[PDB]
Amino acid sequence: SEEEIREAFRVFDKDGNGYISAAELRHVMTNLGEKLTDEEVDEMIREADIDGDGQVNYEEFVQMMT
Amino acid sequence: SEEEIREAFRVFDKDGNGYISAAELRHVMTNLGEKLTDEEVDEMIREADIDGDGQVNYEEFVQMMT
Amino acid sequence: SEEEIREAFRVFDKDGNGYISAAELRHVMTNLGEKLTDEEVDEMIREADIDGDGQVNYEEFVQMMT
Amino acid sequence: SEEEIREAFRVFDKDGNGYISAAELRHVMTNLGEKLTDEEVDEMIREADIDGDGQVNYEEFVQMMT
Amino acid sequence: GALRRRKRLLEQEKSLAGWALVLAGTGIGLMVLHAEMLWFGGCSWALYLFLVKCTISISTFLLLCLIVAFHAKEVQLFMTDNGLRDWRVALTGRQAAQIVLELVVCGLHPAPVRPGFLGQGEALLSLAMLLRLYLVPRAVLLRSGVLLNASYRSIGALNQVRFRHWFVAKLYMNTHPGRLLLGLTLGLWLTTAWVLSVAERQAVNATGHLSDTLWLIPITFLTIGYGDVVPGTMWGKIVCLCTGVMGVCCTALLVAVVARKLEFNKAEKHVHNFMMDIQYTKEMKESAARVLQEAWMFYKHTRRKESHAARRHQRKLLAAINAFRQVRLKHRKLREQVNSMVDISKMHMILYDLQQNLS
Amino acid sequence: GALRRRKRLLEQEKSLAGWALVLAGTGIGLMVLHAEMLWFGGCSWALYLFLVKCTISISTFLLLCLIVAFHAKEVQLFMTDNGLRDWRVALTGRQAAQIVLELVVCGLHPAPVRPGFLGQGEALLSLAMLLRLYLVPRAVLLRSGVLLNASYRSIGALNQVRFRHWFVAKLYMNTHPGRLLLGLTLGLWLTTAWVLSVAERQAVNATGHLSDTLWLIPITFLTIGYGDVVPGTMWGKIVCLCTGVMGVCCTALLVAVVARKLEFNKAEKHVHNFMMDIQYTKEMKESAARVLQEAWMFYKHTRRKESHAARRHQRKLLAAINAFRQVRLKHRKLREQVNSMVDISKMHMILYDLQQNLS
Amino acid sequence: GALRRRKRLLEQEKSLAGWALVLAGTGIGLMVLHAEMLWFGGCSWALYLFLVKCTISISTFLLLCLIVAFHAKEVQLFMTDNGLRDWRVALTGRQAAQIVLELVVCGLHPAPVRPGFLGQGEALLSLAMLLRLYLVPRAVLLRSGVLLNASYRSIGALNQVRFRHWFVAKLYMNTHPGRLLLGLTLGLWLTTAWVLSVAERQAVNATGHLSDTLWLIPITFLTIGYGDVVPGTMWGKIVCLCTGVMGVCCTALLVAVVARKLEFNKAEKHVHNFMMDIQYTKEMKESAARVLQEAWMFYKHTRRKESHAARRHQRKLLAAINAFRQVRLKHRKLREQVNSMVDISKMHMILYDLQQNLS
Amino acid sequence: GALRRRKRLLEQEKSLAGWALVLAGTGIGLMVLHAEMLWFGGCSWALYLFLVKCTISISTFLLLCLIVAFHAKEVQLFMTDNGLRDWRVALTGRQAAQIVLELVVCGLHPAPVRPGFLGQGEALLSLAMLLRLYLVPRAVLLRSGVLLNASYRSIGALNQVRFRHWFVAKLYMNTHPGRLLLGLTLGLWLTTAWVLSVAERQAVNATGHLSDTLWLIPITFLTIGYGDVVPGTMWGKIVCLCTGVMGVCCTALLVAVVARKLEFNKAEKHVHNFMMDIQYTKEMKESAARVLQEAWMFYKHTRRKESHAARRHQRKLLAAINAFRQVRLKHRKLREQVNSMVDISKMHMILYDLQQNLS
Ligand SMILES: CCCCCCCCCCCCO[C@@H]1O[C@H](CO)[C@@H](O[C@H]2O[C@H](CO)[C@@H](O)[C@H](O)[C@H]2O)[C@H](O)[C@H]1O
Ligand SMILES: CCCCCCCCCCCCO[C@@H]1O[C@H](CO)[C@@H](O[C@H]2O[C@H](CO)[C@@H](O)[C@H](O)[C@H]2O)[C@H](O)[C@H]1O
Ligand SMILES: CCCCCCCCCCCCO[C@@H]1O[C@H](CO)[C@@H](O[C@H]2O[C@H](CO)[C@@H](O)[C@H](O)[C@H]2O)[C@H](O)[C@H]1O
Ligand SMILES: CCCCCCCCCCCCO[C@@H]1O[C@H](CO)[C@@H](O[C@H]2O[C@H](CO)[C@@H](O)[C@H](O)[C@H]2O)[C@H](O)[C@H]1O
Ligand SMILES: [K+]
Ligand SMILES: [K+]
Ligand SMILES: [K+]
Ligand SMILES: [K+]
Ligand SMILES: [K+]
């Protein structure tokens, strides 16, 4: 299902560069989807924040999620 | 109506030369059409027979008919 | 609505030059449209007759009308 | 009907060379068609086996059948 | 040219088609008035039943004068069109029998030759007035602009339309369906109800007049057929069969009209295609987020080693990626149809581009 | 060649298809005459009820001779077509059972073996005469030119039409809808009315003959169903169900015929498209003038400083420019369809032009 | 920009279209409650028949306030759209007559001005409440997204759709046929049954209430018409004709819906075309083997000089090669249609290929 | 690979879909037998009415075992397809409610818990057996080859067909219309007639059994509605409304089927176009001769100076040239359509020719 996860990320890849901003990565779960928890979103930022530079290359993030 | 007469002759112009044989000119009225009289067909051959060579250039024949 | 006025003039621009004759400009309101008053048409000719040469460049006439 | 016989052979000509294997020639009557007799298939191999090399050029076989 | 005279004759035929229709309708109306006056009035009103009966004769003599004057305009139109000089050539043999068949049908009024029943004789002559209703398609065809323009007759002769009554039928039915199909059935109900009331009168107990047949005719026309009133006479049953046949034909016409009026044209297809295009992208984003939330939450509850509260999110993850693949494959075939609509004219322009590009 | 003989056999089959149909119809007619003569005549006419009953036997023996003579022509046609020399090869096994099933069905007349009722025996044999109506599609197919031309059989073998009875059904229904669909329902009404009158006779009070069933059958066929007369017997109800089923099927056929007969073809679309093209330009000019009048009159009443009598002309100016934009956008999409009609053949010609232009 | 204000007014019109519909439905419901309470209760409940009758007046005053507030939003929308500054210009003359025709129709309640029958006066005012059902297409059109987006009004002004009520009719009927066509006929049956029960009450023996008309209305609607109950009054017959007309129209609508829902689209045509492609090749091989078996067995029984047991296999050989030619010519025209489906887009791509190939 | 196991499970689902249908039909049959045996037999046969009533319980226990065994195969198929290893993940929450809703509906038999009427209790449980008829579309879908091939599921996943019950509906209706639409209505007539006979029994005078309802149901279905028998009970009227609704729906289905089955395909259009092409040239020659005869005979009778016997031939000359222009302009637009049919593929081949010609 990793190809489906990557294709779901590729919807929000408006840059076509393989990286997505933490603003859009918070806004996708925050404003849309099923629901959003503030502590879970902040813990998601804490888990994905091995870099913490405002942009995440999601290709390694898919492998860390699976 | 002379154009319609010439276009009616042009149906039986299988040579595309402006001349039709007396065999076909007898067979068109004889075998098809409304009816055929033998004496009227022979008088038609006698009237059109200013040449009498087995072939009639119908372009002057239209003018003689009208 | 000045663009709509200019596009309504452009129906009667059969020359494509930006000028229309006073004959056609009288005939458009006179023979067609809602109605035509003779004194109002003559006053329209008196108002548009800053030139009075039988042809009117309607592009300045639109600005004078609005 | 010899053209129809040759066109029926040409369905099983997956090589396009004019020759068909005795394996496929046994399997066509054996596994499909109306029915298959073992002694009739072996007698068919005995009749067509003027060569007996595992491949039959069916073009002469059509002439021997008709 | 004679094309100014040819068009001039087609306003003298339009007026003679209209005024003949007026003098036929005013004969039919006076026939209905006479038939009802002889029923509600009896033998006491024997003066007015002579006055109206001879007014019908005056009107039908004027009608027999307004048809010879029409066919004279048609034979003058024929001489003007094909370039003749003698009317004896221009008249046909079958046409001159159509003249007689038209003058006989337009002359079957009940004349003043000599309790409220019409009698076996004049009740058929009174209903033969309705056979004048062939004057209305002629008048409709002449009032329409397709025959009344030689610039239209040129494109008709290029197409061999040949001035059919059926082309204006298709025309008025494709342009104005509901006005025509609403007026026609009400006219059929009133006309057929009156004819059935003539066929069934029943002076004892008043059981045949319009209070019964105005209920019996639509119930037959719509093929309901309760059966509380049925036709009683042999002539009533013919009318009630010819009502049901027209009801089946008008239902079969209504089905085709309503079937044409439901499809989209080009321009409504475009705005439908845009309303779907702004709507599938919302779900393309929403279901993507629904994948991405559970995609992390299942890994979270897996790394937290709670295997009971992770299987539910794995179940929702499978459901969400199934929904996402459905909405993505649904989204791409819409845009395939968007690319499919602009195929032909763009290739027709690109051909003209690549033709000039070869030089 | 043998293609002169193959065509020669198909006039010997056309005649044997026609004369068999004549000798079947003249058996059905004499059956109807016998069934009515035994009802209106009783036991007094026992001579004519023997004479007609044996005339039927003579006619059906001639019919059983005109079918063997037909199938012999078909087996000679088969030998001529596929190049055979023995008839024992040419005959099939299922075909020789079709021969027997055809000869049995064409041989069920009421024979002269031995008050006005037929009896339980011969009333079924008399109605088994109507099963001869399979001789009419064969005769219609052979009289049509599609089977009777090897130049037509060549294009049929190129298309695998295989001489269906359904292709001539589609043919006669696309060419002559109203003649076929008018004759067929009247034939069904008369035939089914007579069969129902056989099923329901009621010698007491005469309540079952054609004066009732000629009213009951169309009312069932059109699905009105008043219910003043209903079928009374178990055999009458089967006939009144098979009438309603055919009524639903003929209405479903009429809907499709009337749906095809309303659309335009190419040539009527062109003259409709021209009648609209000369008509929208009139309003394109009229509404333009309606803009231009108010456009000056509002400025006049504004410069005259009468603000009360200027707002009305501003209102009409807004309405007129709204109508002008509507008629202009309506006018341009018509001419878009005018450009849309000539797309394909013009590109097919421009491709052949640009192919030669490359050299 | 003012396009934020223009969209802002179209949520103040959506709410004023919804709440007006609620305050019209709660007037119709209280009207039905009053009409049934005055029948089942008589003159004893003269307090509640004043209370409900004035509750209707309070509700219809709130409705007459929720329409002026709607048309004020429309005239502010008109001033915002076309750029005006005075409302006296923005209002039309025919629109201000539509205001009065809307306020009169929405104000015909039975007021509390002053055995179980309503009377000749207030029974028409009570049924004039149902004329409020023009508030539902307005609310449906405003709740739909086609009017409520200037990005949709842009493509509509490019297409001249002009916010029709008929476009959302085609939209909801092409998207949700069965929900709409199932809810609509049940709503018609209940509403028309109640109106017929008002028209036919019959206090003696209780022969007109919903236990009769809930059976009479669907039997009329489906055009069955048993006739065990028929309408008795002149006002009942108008309702039973307007039920049959709507029944014919809904059947004509259902025929077109079911006719659209049977054809294949592109993608179902592809999988049908593949299921046939894997299936005709099986018979292409099977019938080939059926040729090839008899092809040798006939030569075997010929060389064995048994001429009686060889003619049967020659017969089967002819039948098998006939079946093989049928299945081969059937198989190739399927793949012709497979080649026919990919014609246009492949040529559109090959044109762009050969354009670049010229350089 | 596991694609051999995935196909292996879909023959274990086909058998469990067939044998569940057999054990549901043999429960429905024994229910009908019990309901008729308790009516024709009374209280004397109290042994067999216990024996059949417990045979139904044995059969429905076997049915409740053949559904759990089916859904186990579906959850193993789900684990094999999406690659799982625990069944607790593979099962859904809404699916496990569908299991319970399926087992309850398949378990409503009249059990042997404890004059010929069933009673208010068990007459509803006996008719709840018919709710087992959802087992037939599942069995039809599994016996069809579209689900039972992963090579078909590949093209279905390329098309998002998603194994609908509606696709095989369109499939069996486009392939076999008449067999399906003939078997379905007879099955509806027998089933609905029996249910109506249950709803209306009337032990006095035997006025409710199948001899009445087998006549009442088709007359309602075809919307005839004589009205000689009407439903009497409140439960009979619901059944007679649900018969009329299905009758309207089947008529609306038949109209679309007969509308598709009348148009020509490609190959019948070609042979029609050739039969007209060999036929218009005959009249193109015949009418040309009809011009040419009178063209000389009018000049003959003109030169003979007989002006009375020349005008008739001038009249026929005008008629003949009119007919000749009609048949010529009719003849050329046929051949225009002949040129119109071969447009696209010939341009697709000429494009590939001119592409290679550029080098
Ligand atoms: C497309 C086909 C349409 C068919 C249309 C034909 C319609 C014919 C209408 C019926 C006309 C005659 O119908 C008949 O009228 C006569 C008088 O004329 C009336 O008959 C009544 O009056 C006559 C007076 O002569 C008495 O003798 C008679 O005893 C009495 O029944 C009846 O009402 C009706 O039986
Ligand atoms: C597509 C299916 C079509 C089904 C078509 C079948 C049509 C059958 C027509 C009914 C034939 C028999 O119908 C029956 O005829 C008999 C005589 O034969 C008549 O019966 C009458 O005469 C017989 C003479 O034997 C008496 O004994 C009897 O008491 C009396 O009712 C009735 O009129 C009818 O009940
Ligand atoms: C699209 C068109 C739709 C048409 C819809 C029109 C529907 C009209 C419904 C009928 C309304 C009046 O219908 C009529 O109601 C009155 C009371 O009002 C009732 O009439 C009854 O009560 C009145 C009280 O005044 C008594 O005087 C009268 O003797 C008695 O019949 C009847 O039940 C019905 O005859
Ligand atoms: C899509 C919706 C379909 C709706 C289908 C529902 C069908 C229901 C069928 C009716 C079932 C009950 O129908 C009813 O049966 C009962 C027995 O059960 C019978 O009733 C009869 O027997 C009962 C025995 O208890 C007596 O008490 C009663 O006085 C007598 O009328 C009637 O025949 C019928 O009124
Ligand atoms: K009916
Ligand atoms: K009825
Ligand atoms: K009906
Ligand atoms: K009825
Ligand atoms: K009745």
Give the integer Cα–Cα distance in Å for C24 and G175: 52
Give the integer Cα–Cα distance in Å for F189 and F213: 9
D20: β partners = D56
Could you tell which of F212, F235, F240, F249 is best to mutate to test the pocket of ligand 2, judged by most ligand atoms within 8 Å of the CB? F235
Give the integer Cα–Cα distance in Å for F133 and F28: 10
- Check if the beta carbon of residue E123 is closer than 8 Å to that of residue E194: no
H176: left (phi over 0), alpha (psi -120 to 50) or beta: beta
Q: Which amino acid is at H197?
A: S
Write out the two tokens for C28.
Answer: 């458009």
Give the integer Cα–Cα distance in Å for B40 and B19: 22
- Check if the beta carbon of residue E287 is closer than 8 Å to that of residue H64: no
The answer to whether the Cβ–Cβ distance between G292 and D7 falls below 8 Å is no
The closest alpha carbon to E33, from E2, E12, E55, E13, belongs to: E55
Place of tokens 């010899």: D2
Give the integer Cα–Cα distance in Å for H64 and F228: 52
Q: Which of F280, F285, F292 best tests the C interface by mutation, with the highest count of C CBs <10 A?
A: F292
- HSE on the CB side for F280, CA within 13 Å? 18
Nearest CA to ligand 4 atom 6: H235
The closest alpha carbon to F249, from E46, H182, E77, belongs to: H182
Place of tokens 């009421």: F110
Write out the two tokens for G117.
Answer: 């029958």
B56: β partners = B20
The closest alpha carbon to D5, from H137, F125, G317, E196, belongs to: G317
Q: Is E287 exposed, middle or buried (0-12, 13-18, 19+ CB in 10 A)?
A: buried
The closest alpha carbon to A18, from A64, A62, A65, A66, belongs to: A62
The closest alpha carbon to E34, from E113, E130, E126, belongs to: E126
The answer to whether the Cβ–Cβ distance between B4 and H291 falls below 8 Å is yes
- Cβ(G48) – ligand 3 distance below 6 Å: no
- Check if the beta carbon of residue H210 is closer than 8 Å to that of residue H247: no
The closest alpha carbon to H187, from H144, H250, H138, H108, belongs to: H250
Element (H, E) at F270: helix F266-303
Give the integer Cα–Cα distance in Å for F70 and F10: 11
Identify the chains in contact with B, defined as 3+ C-beta pairs within 8 A.
H
Give the integer Cα–Cα distance in Å for H26 and H63: 10
What is the DSSP secondary-structure string of C2-53?
A: HHHHHHHHTTS-SSSSSEEEHHHHHHHHHHSSS---HHHHHHHHHHHTTS-S
Write out the two tokens for F328.
Answer: 């202009």
Q: What is the DSSP-derived secondary structure letter of residue B29?
A: H
Angle (CA) H138-H140-H141 rounded to 5° is: 65
Distance, CA of E66 to chain centre: 29
Identify the chains in contact with C, defined as 3+ C-beta pairs within 8 A.
F
Write out the two tokens for H118.
Answer: 């069933």
Write out the two tokens for F265.
Answer: 């073809």
The closest alpha carbon to E354, from F336, G351, G54, belongs to: G351
Write out the two tokens for F255.
Answer: 């809907």
Strands (E), B8-54: 19-21
Is B41 in the H-facing interface, judged by CB distances under 8 Å? no
The closest alpha carbon to H324, from E165, B3, E6, belongs to: B3
Write out the two tokens for C29.
Answer: 């309101």
Spatial neighbors of F275 by CB under 8 A, at least 6 apart, are E145, E146, E152
In the three-class reduction of DSSP (H, G, I as helix; E, B as strand; rest coil), residue A57 is classed as strand
Burial track G259-270 (b if 16+ CB lie within 10 A, e otherwise):
beeeeeeebbeb
Number of CB atoms found within 10 A of residue F348's CB: 16
**What's the first-to-final CA gap in chain B, in angstroms?**
9
Q: Which of H311, H316, H337, H348 best tests the E interface by mutation, with the highest count of E CBs <10 A?
A: H311
- Check if the beta carbon of residue G358 is closer than 8 Å to that of residue H359: no
Nearest to E351 among F224, F347, F358 (CB): F347
Strands (E), chain B: 19-21, 55-57
The answer to whether the Cβ–Cβ distance between F225 and H228 falls below 8 Å is no
Identify the chains in contact with E, defined as 3+ C-beta pairs within 8 A.
A, F, G, H
Q: Which amino acid is at H254?
A: L
Give the integer Cα–Cα distance in Å for E337 and H17: 38
Give the integer Cα–Cα distance in Å for G196 and D35: 73
List C-alpha distances in Å: G145 to E287, E337, G172, H355.
Answer: 21, 22, 12, 48
- The CA E248 to ligand 7 mean position distance, Å, reads 10
Give the integer Cα–Cα distance in Å for G57 and G54: 5
Write out the two tokens for G135.
Answer: 């508030």
Write out the two tokens for G80.
Answer: 């915002």
Is A9 in the E-facing interface, judged by CB distances under 8 Å? yes
- Cβ(G144) – ligand 3 distance below 6 Å: no
The length of chain F, given as a count of residues: 359
The answer to whether the Cβ–Cβ distance between H270 and F237 falls below 8 Å is no
Place of tokens 């009777």: F148
Nearest to F318 among G82, G314, G330 (CB): G82
- How many angstroms away from the CA of C1 is the closest CA of chain F? 8
Give the integer Cα–Cα distance in Å for H196 and H217: 9
Q: What is the largest CA-CA distance in chain B?
A: 30
Q: E278-281 long-range contacts, Cβ below 8 Å, gap at least 24?
A: E278/G151, E280/E327, E280/E330, E280/E331, E280/E334, E281/E331
**What's the first-to-final CA gap in chain G, in angstroms?**
49
- Check if the beta carbon of residue G137 is closer than 8 Å to that of residue G158: no
Q: What is the DSSP-derived secondary structure letter of residue G227?
A: -
What is the DSSP secondary-structure string of H228-250?
A: SS---SHHHHHHHHHHHHHHHHH
B21: β partners = B55
The closest alpha carbon to B11, from H321, A10, G152, F104, belongs to: H321
Distance, CA of D55 to chain centre: 9
Element (H, E) at A56: strand A55-57
Backbone angles phi, psi at H147, to 5 degrees: -85, -25
- Which residues precede gaps in chain B, with C-N > 2.5 A? none
Give the integer Cα–Cα distance in Å for B24 and B11: 12
Element (H, E) at G150: helix G150-159
Give the integer Cα–Cα distance in Å for C26 and G351: 53
Element (H, E) at H280: helix H266-303
Q: Which residue of F has its CA nearest to E167?
A: F268
What is the DSSP secondary-structure string of E211-223?
A: HHHHHHHHHHHTT
- Cβ(G117) – ligand 3 distance below 6 Å: yes
- Establish whether B49 is an annotated binding residue: yes
Q: What is the DSSP-derived secondary structure letter of residue G326?
A: H
The closest alpha carbon to E172, from E118, E208, E200, E136, belongs to: E136
Element (H, E) at A19: strand A19-21
The number of the ligand nearest the C-alpha atom of E234 reads 1
- Residue numbers in H near B37 (CB within 8 A): none
Strands (E), D1-66: 19-21, 55-57
What is the DSSP secondary-structure string of G1-57?
A: -THHHHHHHHHHHHHHHHHHHHHHHHHHHHHHHHHHHHHHHTTTTTTHHHHHHHHHH
The answer to whether the Cβ–Cβ distance between E267 and G160 falls below 8 Å is yes
Give the integer Cα–Cα distance in Å for G255 and E256: 9
- Residue numbers in E near A42 (CB within 8 A): none
Give the integer Cα–Cα distance in Å for C22 and E289: 68
- HSE on the CB side for E141, CA within 13 Å? 16
D57: β partners = D19
| Helices marked H in E106-176 | 122-127, 135-143, 150-159, 165-175
Spatial neighbors of F201 by CB under 8 A, at least 6 apart, are F39, F116, F117, F208, F209
Q: Which amino acid is at G340?
A: S
- Check if the beta carbon of residue E160 is closer than 8 Å to that of residue F267: yes
- HSE on the CB side for G80, CA within 13 Å? 16
The number of the ligand nearest the C-alpha atom of G124 reads 3
B20: β partners = B56
Give chain E's radius of gyration (CA, Å).
35
Give the integer Cα–Cα distance in Å for H189 and H13: 31
Element (H, E) at H125: helix H122-127
Is D8 in the G-facing interface, judged by CB distances under 8 Å? yes
Give the integer Cα–Cα distance in Å for G84 and G72: 15
Give E72-100 as a 3 state SS string. Answer: HHHHHHHHHHHCCCCHHHHCCCCHHHHHH
In the three-class reduction of DSSP (H, G, I as helix; E, B as strand; rest coil), residue H323 is classed as helix
The closest alpha carbon to B64, from H299, H291, H310, belongs to: H299
The answer to whether the Cβ–Cβ distance between F296 and C44 falls below 8 Å is yes
Give the integer Cα–Cα distance in Å for C36 and C48: 17
Give the integer Cα–Cα distance in Å for F150 and E261: 46
The answer to whether the Cβ–Cβ distance between H318 and E255 falls below 8 Å is no
Backbone angles phi, psi at C57, to 5 degrees: -80, 110
Spatial neighbors of E320 by CB under 8 A, at least 6 apart, are E287, E290, E291, E294
Q: How was this structure determined?
A: cryo-EM
Give the integer Cα–Cα distance in Å for F140 and E155: 40
The answer to whether the Cβ–Cβ distance between G89 and F314 falls below 8 Å is yes
Q: Which residues of D are annotated as a binding site?
A: 13, 15, 17, 19, 24, 49, 51, 53, 55, 60
The closest alpha carbon to F215, from F252, F240, F181, belongs to: F240
In the three-class reduction of DSSP (H, G, I as helix; E, B as strand; rest coil), residue E301 is classed as helix
Q: What is the DSSP-derived secondary structure letter of residue F117?
A: -
E264: β partners = none
Place of tokens 């897996």: E302
- Establish whether A2 is an annotated binding residue: no
Place of tokens 């019938």: G287
Q: What is the DSSP-derived secondary structure letter of residue E133?
A: G
Burial track H283-318 (b if 16+ CB lie within 10 A, e otherwise):
bbbbbbbbbbbbbbbbbbbbeeeeeeebbebbbbbb
- The CA G228 to ligand 9 mean position distance, Å, reads 6
Torsion sign, CA atoms E313, E319, E322, E328: negative
- Check if the beta carbon of residue F227 is closer than 8 Å to that of residue H226: yes
List C-alpha distances in Å: G327 to F157, G270, G289, G317.
Answer: 13, 21, 13, 15
Q: What is the DSSP-derived secondary structure letter of residue G164?
A: -
- Check if the beta carbon of residue H220 is closer than 8 Å to that of residue H244: yes
- Check if the beta carbon of residue F127 is closer than 8 Å to that of residue F195: yes
- Cβ(H233) – ligand 4 distance below 6 Å: yes
Q: Which amino acid is at H112?
A: P
Write out the two tokens for A41.
Answer: 């979103």
- How many angstroms away from the CA of E197 is the closest CA of chain H? 24
